[PDB]
Design a protein around this ligand. Structure first.
Ligand SMILES: Cc1cc2nc3c(=O)[nH]c(=O)nc-3n(C[C@H](O)[C@H](O)[C@H](O)COP(=O)(O)OP(=O)(O)OC[C@H]3O[C@@H](n4cnc5c(N)ncnc54)[C@H](O)[C@@H]3O)c2cc1C
Length: 432
């Protein structure tokens, strides 16, 4: 009697995976996507005549779920070559910019990182069960900043590790939950070189959008875009989904894959469990944005860190040449520190870092300003990871997926895929 067997809300990797799992079981499947595009927090675009990535793009074979999908659909890796750096910079909170030899730069960040994750081997024997250990549950009382003050790092190492960690937090390190960082490093084999190789090294052949289209075509599910969901009501043996144009779609089961910071704008009747509402209100930490800057001068191959109080926390050469100039890939930890769609502020901060250059153009994506992300990658605040099962738990015939709800690579494409497989199995148990 329902319009569809299962409705999936959201066309990111969590939604595409769930829709594919449901479709291949023969269920009549519908996916509703708020934007006029798919991919969610993965978005490939173009700038200054080149391909650029505004969100997620990089993967690794140490991430099980996304790698198995690439095997399923015959997609290989595309390498961004490690390359030698000409300059590595650190910008401290005082505003001073230092140029360090790239060989000193790598040694100091590794020392600081390895001391911060010294206990990951003991505390997370099973990174896919983060709360297995007691130590893990007692560490969720502390922030990443709490550990860094005890490590006794030099001024350079602390600025490096704090900038790198502010980037993973999308926020200041005093807000950043400690165990979530150790668990992610545990997922990469408890090893520094293995984990660092997963970061900005390999992209998917055909792009993230190609693998998302592969799964959705394979699912057979009906896909609608520019259809935001505004409310969900639990009916008798199903659910009622209301779109922003007030039309009602009925289904036996509905799967939520929207980012956690967007649940505030969807109404649920009846109300969800209070443990769920708590993560509904708090949200996830990251307030990041992504920015690309085109400069007339050819800076070669540069990398820079800036600490939490400064705007351009992660800068790296995307491409360079004398004819082109330099295209810089920049990640902003916090929205409050700079408006990426304000060019004049962007030009000043690039010039502060690289005095003497004039920006020819800028391309930005402010994920925190976007109504359908309201934040960047998944980052847990202090105490959140221990209550993660409140966010994963099904509420009647409403299932919940998404990178934030995953147990492994929660800050990654892989975590979204993992949650999609779990959601598909929970669909299989309700429809039987
Ligand atoms: C700048 C940035 C860089 C990143 N780089 C990497 C990387 O290099 N490697 C890696 O592994 N991961 C990376 N990530 C993380 C990765 O992008 C995410 O973890 C993953 O895409 C999350 O998948 P998801 O489906 O759970 O969320 P989403 O991709 O956000 O999917 C949710 C979908 O639901 C839609 N939606 C929202 N609200 C509604 C609504 N009311 N109704 C209908 N639809 C709605 C949204 O528009 C969206 O399409 C990055 C993230 C960011 C922000």
């Amino acid at each position: 009697g329902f319009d569809y067997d299962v409705v999936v809300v959201g066309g990111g990797f969590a939604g595409a995976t769930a829709a594919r799992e449901c479709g291949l079981q023969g269920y009549r499947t519908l996916l509703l996507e708020a934007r006029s595009r798919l991919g969610g927090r993965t978005f490939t675009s173009r700038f200054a005549g080149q391909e650029i990535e505004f969100g997620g793009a990089w993967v690794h074979w140490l991430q099980p779920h996304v790698w198995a999908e690439m095997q399923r659909y015959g997609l290989g890796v595309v390498e961004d070559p490690l390359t030698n750096l000409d300059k590595t910079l650190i910008m401290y909170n005082d505003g001073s910019v230092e140029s360090i030899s790239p060989d000193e730069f790598g040694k100091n960040i590794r020392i600081a990182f390895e001391k911060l994750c010294h206990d990951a081997w003991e505390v997370f024997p099973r990174p896919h069960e983060p709360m297995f250990t007691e130590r893990a549950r007692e560490l969720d009382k502390s922030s990443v900043l709490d550990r860094i003050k005890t490590l006794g790092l030099s001024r350079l190492q602390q600025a490096q590790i704090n900038s790198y960690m502010a980037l993973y937090a999308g926020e200041t390190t005093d807000k950043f939950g400690l165990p979530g960082v150790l668990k992610l490093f545990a997922c990469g084999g408890w090893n520094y070189d293995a984990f660092m190789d997963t970061e900005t090294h390999y992209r998917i052949q055909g792009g993230t959008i190609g693998l998302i289209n592969a799964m959705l075509t394979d699912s057979g599910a009906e896909v609608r875009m520019s259809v935001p969901v505004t409310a969900v009501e639990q009916v008798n043996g199903g659910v009622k989904i209301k779109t922003d144009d007030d039309e009602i779609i009925t289904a036996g089961v509905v799967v939520m894959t929207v980012p956690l910071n967007t649940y505030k704008h969807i109404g649920f009747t009846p109300a969800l469990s209070k443990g769920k509402q708590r993560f509904i209100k708090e949200g996830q930490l990251s307030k990041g944005a992504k920015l690309y800057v085109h400069v007339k001068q050819n800076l070669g191959r540069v990398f820079a860190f800036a600490d939490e109080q400064q705007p351009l926390n992660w800068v790296q050469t995307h491409d360079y040449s004398d004819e082109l100039g330099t295209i810089l890939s920049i990640t902003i930890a916090r929205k409050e520190t700079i408006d990426v769609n304000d060019r004049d502020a962007v030009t000043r901060e690039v010039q502060k870092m690289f005095p003497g250059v004039e920006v020819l153009g800028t391309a930005a994506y402010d994920w925190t300003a976007d109504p359908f992300s309201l934040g960047a990658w998944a980052a847990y605040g202090v105490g959140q990871l221990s209550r993660l099962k409140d966010l994963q738990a099904a509420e009647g015939r409403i299932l919940f997926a998404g990178a934030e709800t995953s147990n492994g690579w929660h800050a990654n494409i892989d975590g979204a895929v993992e949650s999609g497989l779990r959601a598909g199995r929970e669909v299989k148990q309700l429809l039987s």
